[PDB]
Amino acid sequence: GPIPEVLKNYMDAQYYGEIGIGTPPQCFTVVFDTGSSNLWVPSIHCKLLDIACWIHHKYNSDKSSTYVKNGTSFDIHYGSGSLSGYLSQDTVSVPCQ
Amino acid sequence: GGVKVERQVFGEATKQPGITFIAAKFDGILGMAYPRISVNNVLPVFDNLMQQKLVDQNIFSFYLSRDPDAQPGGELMLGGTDSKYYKGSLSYLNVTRKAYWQVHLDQVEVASGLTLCKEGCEAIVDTGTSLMVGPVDEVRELQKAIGAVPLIQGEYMIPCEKVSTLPAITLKLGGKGYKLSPEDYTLKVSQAGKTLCLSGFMGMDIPPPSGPLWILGDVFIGRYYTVFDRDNNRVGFAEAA
Ligand SMILES: *[C@@H]1O[C@H](CO)[C@@H](O[C@@H]2O[C@H](CO)[C@@H](O[C@@H]3O[C@H](CO[C@H]4O[C@H](CO)[C@@H](O)[C@H](O)[C@@H]4O)[C@@H](O)[C@H](O)[C@@H]3O)[C@H](O)[C@H]2NC(C)=O)[C@H](O)[C@H]1NC(C)=O
Ligand SMILES: *[C@@H]1O[C@H](CO)[C@@H](O)[C@H](O)[C@H]1NC(C)=O
Structure with a gap:
């Protein structure tokens, strides 16, 4: 049917919800941002x-059986934050199921 | 319920400069705008969903709670609408440039007389921006017309005590006027605490070639339940319940 994602509300300033990357799902919280189009989470190999x-x-990629490497670098600059890392492939679950 | 989007390319962040994510309670960002603004032409998650035909309608809706001590804090509904969170009927607007969810704003009128964006302007609907933002010059006029004082860098503060004396501001979208009362556009904040309300409009110039652009952030999406339609490239709003 429609898939409900419950969002948490931090101070009417940050709204985020939980999703999974990998098999089995590693759970992360993300803001469902209609102002950008990339998905990213911190790497365990972050500097x-x-x-x-x-x-x-x-x-952690090594804990997921469905991970396919990509390794291509990426650099995203938001009008606030900046980040970079490399790209990867795996299943995304919403909610962490 | 739960969806499995398979074979999604996403980035593993290794360097994240500055204060901005030290202070963030979330781990990452799942962008939900169109593919044109996607870094490395990585197909977005909802584009991947549409392609794997995981939902009936290619839409998703946002209910955001404006009381931080409320459970639930809001609700993103994928592939549908949740009528338990809005009143009346959705009124839609078509996407002008298909990259962000860009819509045309007709004018911003603050009831004390001032009308900003007369001639009409372009606006994007962004769930990732907390505040309403507009061009530095028009937002300083709007803030003076409401009597807020400068905090720093385009943000303004108003005494929470003073909020009931304030004007309502109406954004006119597609012929209809959407009203934000003083309690809709101001946020209570604390450290020492309370009595400190932020004016919910931030003045920031967004440069050509994409800008100028007003941004309708969580301040607007918190009064008006929002529906993003990928099937027909339009945005729909209804009074949140
Ligand atoms: C890592 O990620 C991907 C999967 O593992 C692969 O890399 C990316 O592959 C996609 C296709 O899925 C490429 O994107 C396509 O681009 C073409 C061309 O774009 C046109 O439009 C843009 C502006 O909109 C314009 O500037 C261009 O000049 C073109 O005229 C489109 O037709 C497709 O719809 C799709 O968007 C990416 O380009 C590519 N990204 C990168 C950084 O290479 C790749 O397999 C994986 N990498 C490795 C090393 O395996
Ligand atoms: C939206 O676009 C259609 C054609 O796709 C046009 O006829 C219609 O009047 C537009 N309506 C709105 C509300 O933007």
Whole structure:
């Protein structure tokens, strides 16, 4: 039918919901952003410089049986934040199911 | 329910510069705009969903709660609408440029007389922006017409005490006027705390060639339940319940 995603509300400023990457699903929270078109989560291979990554959930490819590597680099600049990493392929689940 | 989108390309972030994600409670972003603005032409998640024919209608709707202590905090509905969260009927607007969800705004009128964007302008509907944003010059006029004071960098503050004396602002979209009352467009914030309400309009210039653009963020999507239609490239709004 329609698939409901429940969103959390942080201070009427951040609304995010939970999704899974991998088999079995590793759960992450993301904002469903209608202002961009890329999906990204922190890598467990994020560099030490990436302070943000220390305090968030990181994705580990080696724990997913359906992961297909891609490795191509990407660099996204939002009108606020900037990030970069490499691309990868796997199943995305919404909710973390 | 639950969908499995298979074979999705997504990025593993390794460097994330600045304060901006240290402070964010979320782990990542799942972008839901059209493919044109996709970095590396990576097919978006909802495009992948449509292609694998995972839902009946290629639409998704956003209910966002404007009370932070509410359960649930909002609800994204994929492939449908949730009528338990809106009143009356959806009124739709067509996407002008198919990249962000771009819609044409007819004018912004603040009831004390001031009309901004007279001549009409372009606006994007962005669930990832908290505030309403518009061009620096028009937003300073709007803020002076409501009496908010500058905080820093295009953000303005108003005493929470003063919010009931404030004008309502109406954005006219596709001939209809959508009203934001003072409680819809101001946010309470705290550190020492309370009495500190942000004016929900931020002044930021978005440069050519994409801009100028007003952004209808979570302040608007929180009063008006929003429907993004990929099947017919239009956006629909109804009063959230
Ligand atoms: C990593 O990611 C992908 C899957 O693992 C593969 O890389 C990407 O593959 C897609 C196809 O799925 C390519 O995108 C296509 O681009 C063409 C051409 O685009 C035209 O339009 C743009 C503007 O809209 C214009 O600037 C161009 O000049 C073209 O005129 C489209 O016809 C397709 O619909 C689709 O969008 C990507 O280009 C490609 N990305 C990159 C960075 O290579 C690839 O298999 C994987 N990488 C590896 C090494 O395996
Ligand atoms: C939307 O586009 C159609 C054609 O696709 C046009 O005839 C219609 O009047 C437009 N309506 C709105 C509400 O933008």
